[PDB]
Amino acid sequence: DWRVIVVVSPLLIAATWAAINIGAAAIRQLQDVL
Amino acid sequence: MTPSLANFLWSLVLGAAIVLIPATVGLIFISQKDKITR
Amino acid sequence: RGWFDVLDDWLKRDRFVFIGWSGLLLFPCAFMALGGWLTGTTFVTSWYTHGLASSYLEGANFLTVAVSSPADAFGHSLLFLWGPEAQGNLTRWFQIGGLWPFVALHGAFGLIGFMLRQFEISRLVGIRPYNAIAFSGPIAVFVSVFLMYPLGQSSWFFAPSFGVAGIFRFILFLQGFHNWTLNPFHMMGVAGILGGALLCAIHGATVENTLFEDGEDSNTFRAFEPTQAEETYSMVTANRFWSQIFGIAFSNKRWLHFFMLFVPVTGLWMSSVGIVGLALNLRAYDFVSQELRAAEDPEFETFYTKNILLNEGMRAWMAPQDQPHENFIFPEEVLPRGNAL
Amino acid sequence: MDRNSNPNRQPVELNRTSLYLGLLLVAVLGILFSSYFFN
Amino acid sequence: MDRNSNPNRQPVELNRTSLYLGLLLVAVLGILFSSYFFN
Amino acid sequence: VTYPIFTVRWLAVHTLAVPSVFFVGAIAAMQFIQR
Amino acid sequence: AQRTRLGDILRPLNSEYGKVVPGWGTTPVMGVFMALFLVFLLIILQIYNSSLILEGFSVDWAG
Amino acid sequence: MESVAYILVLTMALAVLFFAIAFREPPRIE
Amino acid sequence: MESVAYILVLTMALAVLFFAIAFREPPRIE
Amino acid sequence: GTTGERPFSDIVTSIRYWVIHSITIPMLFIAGWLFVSTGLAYDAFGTPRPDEYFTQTRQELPILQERYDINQEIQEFN
Amino acid sequence: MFAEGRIPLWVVGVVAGIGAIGVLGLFFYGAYAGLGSSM
Amino acid sequence: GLPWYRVHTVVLNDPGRLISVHLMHTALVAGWAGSMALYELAIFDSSDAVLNPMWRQGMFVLPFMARLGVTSSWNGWSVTGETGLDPGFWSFEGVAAAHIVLSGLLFLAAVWHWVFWDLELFVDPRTGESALDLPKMFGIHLFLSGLLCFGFGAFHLTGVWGPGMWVSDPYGLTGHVQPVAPEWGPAGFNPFNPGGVVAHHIAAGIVGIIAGLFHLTVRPPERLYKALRMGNIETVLSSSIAAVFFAAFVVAGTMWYGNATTPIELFGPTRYQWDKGYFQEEIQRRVDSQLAEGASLSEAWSTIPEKLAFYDYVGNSPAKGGLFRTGAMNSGDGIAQEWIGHPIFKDKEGRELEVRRMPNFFETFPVIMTDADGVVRADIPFRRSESKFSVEQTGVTVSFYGGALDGQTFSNPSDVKKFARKAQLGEGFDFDTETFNSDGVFRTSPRGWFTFGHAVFALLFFFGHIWHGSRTLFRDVFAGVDPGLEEQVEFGVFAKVGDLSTRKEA
Amino acid sequence: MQVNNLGFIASILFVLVPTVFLLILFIQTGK
Amino acid sequence: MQVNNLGFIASILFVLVPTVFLLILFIQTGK
Ligand code: CLA
Ligand code: CLA
Ligand code: CLA
Ligand SMILES: CCCCCCCCCCCCCCCC(=O)OC[C@H](CO[C@@H]1O[C@H](CS(=O)(=O)O)[C@@H](O)[C@H](O)[C@H]1O)OC(=O)CCCCCCCCCCCCCCC
Ligand SMILES: CCCCCCCCCCCCCCCC(=O)OC[C@H](COP(=O)(O)OC[C@@H](O)CO)OC(=O)CCCCCCCCCCCCCCC
Ligand SMILES: CC1=C(/C=C/C(C)=C/C=C/C(C)=C/C=C/C=C(C)/C=C/C=C(C)/C=C/C2=C(C)CCCC2(C)C)C(C)(C)CCC1
Ligand SMILES: CC1=C(/C=C/C(C)=C/C=C/C(C)=C/C=C/C=C(C)/C=C/C=C(C)/C=C/C2=C(C)CCCC2(C)C)C(C)(C)CCC1
Ligand SMILES: CC1=C(/C=C/C(C)=C\C=C/C(C)=C/C=C/C=C(C)/C=C/C=C(C)\C=C\C2=C(C)CCCC2(C)C)C(C)(C)CCC1
Ligand SMILES: CCCCCCCCCCCCO[C@@H]1O[C@H](CO)[C@@H](O[C@H]2O[C@H](CO)[C@@H](O)[C@H](O)[C@H]2O)[C@H](O)[C@H]1O
Ligand SMILES: [Ca+2]
Ligand SMILES: [Fe+2]
């Protein structure tokens, strides 16, 4: 269903933008807690 | 062995596998990782 | 370090949102209940259970939306998603009103988790658990109204719907069908709630108007620090004021605050006992002496008999729409009505 | 066997304010429920 | 005017034997007069 | 200094606020549905 | 504290005040039994609720 | 229903008799 | 005759109000 | 006073926070918008669109009366 | 805006409040248009 | 001194006087049972089990005696309508007398324990003070409970040595006490199967014996001892109040919804039997069976039993009472004398009309007559100025089959409207309203009163549990908080809430 | 039996009022 | 009016029994 694609895809864009703007500090916080 | 019996048994299994068991593993994992230093 | 005690350490950390052992019951259940209510009032109809539109998707507003009660045909079926009605179909489950027992059950277990949270944090902080004892009132209300009232009735249909106008419907329904204003248990509830509101207002006004001059600013709020030892307001002046104004006054701070606890909690418990009675249609509907007289004497009218007539009119004009599963066909000539209206 | 004195005996108090509050509560409960007792 | 304490206040006693005698008298007066109250 | 970013408070905020903004956008689109 | 014959008979049943098994003891076996009790309560509730329908009978006055 | 009243008043007298025998103030030589 | 009972219970409440105002335990600073 | 977490007034007054949210919050908004405007919410929840409250063969209220076979009941109700 | 790496919190607040007022006004506009407008 | 609401605390650390107060409560309960049964026996009418059974007469404890096997009286009557039986000693009067005598014995035993409170059994030999080994007492009492439960299921319920329990047909016409065999299949969890109750007590008694043996041989874990405060008797009070409100909610539910243990001959029909037309459906099935056999309408309707028709009457539904409509159901409509027979209403065009019945919700209900295809053909209009479907215009006549009015036809519209209003209440009955001066408003049955009392008590006992559980777990701060409590309640100082060793020092 | 309608209330009050007076006086004795 | 025959005795006892309990407790206080 194209409806499912065009509904999920905005969430995917939001998640990937948050990931590529927070991922360095996210991996650092994951490392510091082992 | 009825459809309602099978649905109840699957509810037991999937309430364990969706809610109870992965929360138990996640709590145990994050409590072992982020320990309190005395 | 045992794994239980390590988990106990992690659950009871001093963070922004306290979790605790009670949080494992509270947070998923409260989230499920709140998300179910928001989901139902945003997207889910009551068209097949009630013949009504009750979501924002259908054009209802914040007053007119509800997670409505399920269809009367199901009885007191718990209406699980995997249950024999819905049979795993989420869409069918939404349409048959399964969001109502979803919200009501998760809400009830979340309320349990919240009073457990009150107990847990009271134990950790080191205070007495009177907040949980006070919260017993709201849980008594929720259990009597949303659970034992429909359980005593024919189905979950006659439970209150989780909505503003749905609750107003439940309220008017209990007036017209049960004469719930006439019930003394509700009168004690009303007395408790209005007394709690009175005590709140009077206690706040008395403290704010018997404050000690403990600062140089006209803004009196900065003349307090939490770690101070002495009282921020004059109990002696407050006592003298209310003794000369009202006749009596509080002379004990602890008794004052226990009474502020006691009045609305007792009102809630009393109204809950009345709702338990109403679950079995054990109403204070009538004063039989006045009906026997009114049936014998057509000159006898009180405000009670007028209220009885109001209830009859409401029942006859509301029941075909409020209970569409019954297929109540009331032709216009049988509807009770006064002259010219 | 001997009849010994019990050391767990403790006096009961009800002060005047508590008496007035209880008497008022009992009076208003009678006022509330008498019409339903008569029916 | 001042509200002075009264020195004529004196305690009232009723002992247990007097209580039993009064309770028995009241019970037998009820037993005697109840049939006439009902008539 | 050097605070964590992902906390229980972070999840507590999003669990509520991400579906809140999703639902608000839904109801905003509902405002333009014709009869 | 006055001795009676019945008291002297019943004395060993009230002599173990505060005796404990150190640690967790049989708490896991307890929790297994509480889980089984909860499942049994769920079964009989859903049978009475007609949410669990079993062959061989119906929940009705005629069985 | 008068039978209930008669039974109650007779029972009150008999209970008074029991409590006056079993729980009298003990006579003490002093 | 129920009117007598209603008058008595209302009178009991009003008498309680009078005796609680006029004959309260006085609040004493100590 | 501070339980350990970064204070909210520090967080929401940052460039990096608003760089992430200038994107996340509006695009969640448009996700809800496309949930409604593509009509997927009607199919997901079973809510009637404004022309399926009544069909050409049913003009009354489709009050469920079946206790177990509700799927076929909703189907013949349409 | 007047700082180093920072936005004033009152600017953030006025933007958020304007957005909240706007979505409330849109929800009140939808009371008079489209579904639920009685027309 | 002690406030009024705490006076009973005096026996908190006095096991002898605690046992004495328990005896006094047990004596008062047993004496209530005996005196309530004696009052019920003094006012019971045994003349007609069909139309004046126990549940029309306000009989509360008499169904509970009848349920477990005591159906007969010394006077000579039985609640099943049989006469001339010899119950032995265990009639209603003998059971009432046994509870009165037991109450007196328990009163005397309570007096003894109150007076001789300082028994050597209650003090610890290790220390010098009063101590109850509550896990061991629990194990003994659990073992006794399991033994009694097993004996009640396996001997009394099965009739191996005992009377059995009350069973009936699905329509409550042939109820009697019989031995009941245990059902060990899944139909033992059918709540309307009495063999399920028999198996439950046998199996739960065996499990209680095994659990009592465990709770007798195995000491509690130290973690559970400290967590549940097992040295405090208030934790027993809290958990017992919890179990007790659990069981009270259960018995209120089984009373209201109907059970094998709540038969309709003893407590009355349920509201759900009126709701779904259970008795009306069975009555119509029997009439259709006789019509298919080839009988006339009067013949088919004259073999409906009057008891079955009496069940099909909204005044016997427990959801028609009032909270202050006190007493027996015979104080309401009256004592039922006879069934008037089944009405058939026909309009002037020959269509058969059915009066829409009054639901349990409605204090008043409009009189509506619909045909076979659900179209309203007659009514009793409020406004007559625009009346179209009145009985007068539609020419509705009514013919009665069976009962007192069998073979009769009423065409005068006042009689037809009166019979329409009667048919609104289900099967019509003639009532004697002068014996108890019946006021005409419906009462609820003992089923409804039991459900109301037990539901309300279960709700209030939820508060008791919370109160005592909180008093148990917070015993240290009952007089107040510590006079310090400063640094531990500050935010962010300690890593764990309330833990001193978890100070961050930062 | 056709008894006086006030017989029950008169009997209960005739017993109970001086019973209450005696119990009040006995319980307060020693104060 | 056609009232409950037990309404008067129930109202008087409902008022008077806890009134008596409170008066007993107040008068003995200080002993
Ligand atoms: C051996 C003594 C004895 C006998 C043979 C009887 C017999 C009877 N009693 Mg009586 N009674 C007794 C002692 C006795 N009583 C005592 C000591 C008291 C004071 C407490 C009473 C107070 C009393 C009252 C108030 C009433 C009776 C009534 C009755 C009649 C019906 C009982 C009934 O409904 O069962 C009901 C019993 C139960 C449902 C048992 C509940 C037990 C629960 C389910 C167990 C709790 C859980 C358990 C502790 C833990 C699980 C155990 C498991 C693991 C094994 C019956 C003739 C009734 C009557 O008809 O009045 C005349 C009635 O109203 N009795
Ligand atoms: C829960 C147990 C219970 C149940 C279910 C019943 C049920 C029944 N009884 Mg019974 N009875 C009981 C206990 C019970 N009784 C006890 C303990 C006694 C000894 C006093 C009696 C003595 C008795 C007699 C003499 C009679 C009955 C009768 C009846 C039947 C008629 C009901 C009725 O009119 O009452 C009406 C109920 C009410 C009006 C409700 C009262 C609720 C009170 C007023 C609420 C109080 C509010 C509270 C004070 C406010 C709180 C304040 C707050 C700040 C805390 C009915 C089936 C009658 C019968 O039919 O005999 C065959 C009959 O004549 N009973
Ligand atoms: C079997 C259950 C049970 C038992 C053994 C107890 C026992 C106790 N309670 Mg608890 N409690 C219970 C259930 C129980 N409670 C329930 C159900 C509630 C909710 C209503 C409470 C709420 C409660 C509170 C708020 C308090 C207690 C307190 C106490 C302690 C002192 C009691 C006292 O002197 O008051 C004396 C009572 C009077 C002088 C008059 C009360 C008369 C009542 C209002 C009406 C009479 C009832 C009637 C005669 C019998 C019908 C009851 C029956 C149907 C259950 C004592 C340990 C007190 C405490 O904790 O002490 C430190 C306390 O403050 N209880
Ligand atoms: C919604 C989310 C769900 C939330 C889940 C929360 C996490 C689970 C909390 C569990 C609380 C109870 C466990 C307490 C620890 C304990 O008792 O055991 C202590 C032991 C040993 O611990 C160690 O043992 C040592 C020795 S001793 O055991 O004390 O003797 C001791 O020194 C040491 O301290 C101790 O750590 O730990 C174990 O691993 C036992 C695991 C089993 C515990 C009970 C679980 C049973 C659940 C029933 C479900 C299965 C049945 C299904 C039926 C269909
Ligand atoms: C500017 C708003 C004023 C509106 C009046 C409402 C506030 C006062 C109500 C209190 C009544 C009880 C009186 C005794 C209580 C009493 O004695 O108060 C005492 C309290 C102490 O004030 P201070 O003496 O320190 O200062 C007040 C003046 O003396 C000088 O500033 O007074 C105030 O706090 C006034 C602050 C009101 C200003 C902001 C309040 C805004 C609330 C209303 C907002 C709208 C509500 C509806 C929205 C849905
Ligand atoms: C049902 C269900 C579920 C769940 C879900 C969930 C849990 C979810 C959710 C959800 C959510 C959680 C949602 C949300 C939301 C929201 C909203 C919708 C909001 C809002 C709002 C508003 C509108 C506001 C406004 C305002 C005001 C009024 C005040 C101030 C200002 C402002 C403007 C802010 C699941 C899947 C599991 C399964 C199936 C069932
Ligand atoms: C001494 C003795 C004896 C005798 C015994 C007897 C004779 C008895 C009895 C007993 C009895 C005869 C009893 C009783 C009881 C009663 C009760 C215990 C009650 C009650 C009450 C109540 C509790 C109620 C309440 C209420 C009300 C009032 C209102 C409504 C609600 C209610 C229900 C809450 C003999 C010789 C044998 C032996 C030797 C010893
Ligand atoms: C409350 C709050 C907030 C918020 C706020 C907002 C959100 C807003 C606002 C506001 C605004 C946003 C505004 C405005 C303004 C403007 C104005 C006031 C103006 C003017 C003027 C005029 C007067 C006009 C004139 C004219 C005319 C007449 C015609 C010609 C042209 C013209 C246009 C010139 C904040 C956070 C801050 C703080 C806290 C809370
Ligand atoms: C805000 C929360 C969002 C709500 C969730 C959005 C999705 C809602 C459901 C729509 C998805 C498809 O909608 C419906 O899904 C159900 C599962 O429940 C499918 O149901 C299918 O699987 C279930 C599970 O075994 C069984 O009933 C059966 O095998 C089959 O019907 C239906 O075939 C489909 O019509
Ligand atoms: Ca006309
Ligand atoms: Fe305060």
In this structure, which residue's CA is closest to atom 32 in ligand 7? L453
* Chain F contact partners (≥3 CB pairs within 8 A): A, C, J, K
Q: H/E element holding C66?
A: strand C66-67
Query: Would you call J4 helix, strand, or coil by DSSP?
Result: coil
The best mutation among C198, C200, C208, C237 to test binding of ligand 5, ranked by most ligand atoms within 8 Å of the C-beta, falls on: C208
Given an 8 Å threshold on Cβ–Cβ distance, is L231 in contact with G18?
A: yes
Written as six digits, the tokens of C147 are: 């659970």
L341: left (phi over 0), alpha (psi -120 to 50) or beta: left
Q: How far is the CA of K26 from the centre of ligand 8 (A)?
A: 18
- The CB density around residue M24, as the number of other CB atoms within 10 Å, is 19
Q: Which residues of chain A does B33 touch, with a Cβ-Cβ cutoff of 8 Å? A: 33-34
Decide whether any atom of ligand 9 lies within 6 Å of the C35 Cβ: no
- For L221, the token pair is 């874990």
User: Which other chains touch chain L, taking contact as 3+ CB pairs less than 8 Å apart?
Assistant: B, C, D, G, H, J, N
C-alpha–C-alpha distance, residues N19 and N13, integer Å? 9
Residue type at C97 in one-letter notation: G
L chain contacts of residue B36, beta-carbon cutoff 8 Å: 495-496, 502
DSSP state of L50: T
Q: Does the Cβ of C39 fall within 6 Å of ligand 9?
A: yes
* L331 burial via Cβ count (<10 Å: 0-12, 13-18, 19+): buried
Q: Are J1 and L492 in contact (CB under 8 A)?
A: yes
Q: How far apart are CA F14 and CA C36, in angstroms?
A: 17
Determine whether the annotation assigns residue C106 to a binding site.
Answer: yes
Residue J21 known to bind ligand = yes
Q: Hey, what are L286's tokens?
A: 């029997």
- Rg over CA atoms, chain M: 14
Domain span holding position C124:
1-341
The pair of structure tokens assigned to C136 is 């017993």
Instruction: Give the pair of three-digit tokens for residue F4.
Output: 């964590």
Q: CB of L192 within 8 A of CB of G60?
A: yes
Closest residue of chain C to J42, computed from CA coordinates = C43
Residue C24, ligand 9, Cβ within 6 A: no
First to last CA, chain H: 51
Q: Which residues contact C190 (CB under 8 A, 6 or more apart)?
A: C267, C271
Instruction: Find chain D residues with C-beta within 8 A of G2's C-beta.
Output: 1-2, 4
Residues with CB under 6 A from ligand 7: L 28, 31-32, 35, 100-101, 103-104, 107-108
**What's the CA gap between L355 and L277, in Å, rounded?**
13
Looking from the CA of residue L70, the nearest atom of ligand 1 is: 57
What residues pair up with L496 in beta bridges, in sequence order?
C13
| CB–CB contact I25 D17 (8 Å) | yes
In short, whether C222's Cβ falls inside 6 Å of ligand 5 is no
Q: Which chain B residues touch L501 with a CB distance below 8 Å?
A: 38
Length of chain E (residues):
39
Q: Are L491 and C226 in contact (CB under 8 A)?
A: no
Q: Does N7 touch chain D (CB under 8 A)?
A: yes
Q: Which residues surround ligand 10, an ion (CB under 5 A)?
A: L 385
Query: What stretches of L293-449 adopt beta strand conformation (E)?
Result: 335-339, 342-346, 352-355, 368-370, 376-379, 397-401, 408-410, 429-432
What CA–CA distance (Å, rounded) separates C309 from C314?
9
Nearest CA owner, ligand 1 atom 8:
L65
Residues contacting residue L401 through CB under 8 Å, at least 6 positions apart = L297, L298, L300, L301, L302, L341, L342, L344, L407
Listing DSSP states for B1-38 in one string gives --HHHHHHHHHHHHHIIIIIHHHHHHHHHHHHHSPPP-
Ligand 5 pocket member C218 (CB < 6 A): yes
Task: Please provide residue D12's backbone torsions phi and psi, each rounded to the nearest 5 degrees.
Answer: -100, 135
- Residue L345, helix vs strand vs coil: strand
How far is ligand 4, taken at its centre, from the CA of residue B20, in Å?
A: 14
Token output for C308: 């009885």
Side by side, the strands of the sheet bearing L352-355 are L376-379, L368-370, L352-355, L342-346, L397-401, L408-410
On chain N, the residues whose CB falls within 8 A of the CB of I9 are: 11, 15
- Every domain of chain J and the residues it spans: 8-77
Number of domains in chain C: 1
Sign of CA dihedral C68, C73, C77, C82: negative
Method of determination is: cryo-EM
Q: Could you give the residue ranges of the DSSP H alpha helices within chain D? A: 16-38
Contacts of K30 (CB under 8 A, 6+ apart): F30, F31, F32, K36, K37
User: CB contact, 8 Å: A10 with chain J?
Assistant: yes
Distance between CA atoms of residues H11 and C317, nearest Å: 57
Q: Are the CB atoms for L62 and L75 separated by under 8 Å?
A: no
What resolution (Å)?
Answer: 2.1
DSSP for L136-165 reads HHHHHHHHHHHHHHHHIIIIIITTTTS--E
- Residue ranges per structural domain of chain G: 1-51
Q: Which residue of C has its CA nearest to F18?
A: C35
Distance from the alpha carbon of residue L445 to the mean position of ligand 2, in angstroms? 13
Ligand 5 centroid from CA C246, angstroms:
24
| Pairing of β L165-167 and β L352-355 | unpaired
Alpha-carbon dihedral sign for residues L213, L216, L217, L221: positive
One-character DSSP codes across M3-30: --TTHHHHHHHHHHHHHHHHHHHHHTTT
Give the whole-angstrom CA distance, residue L25 versus residue L204. Answer: 27
Q: Which atom of ligand 1 is nearest the CA belonging to L96? A: 62
Buried b (16+ CB within 10 A) or exposed e, N9-24: bbbbbbbbebbbebbb
CATH of J8-77, one of 2.60.120.260, 1.20.5.860, 3.40.50.2020, 2.40.110.10: 1.20.5.860
Q: Does I20 touch chain C (CB under 8 A)?
A: yes
CA distances from J27 to A3, C38, C42, F6, F18 (A): 16, 20, 19, 21, 11
Contact partners, residue N8, CB within 8 Å, separation at least 6: D38, I1, I2, I5, M9
Nearest residue of chain M to residue N30 (CA atoms)? M31
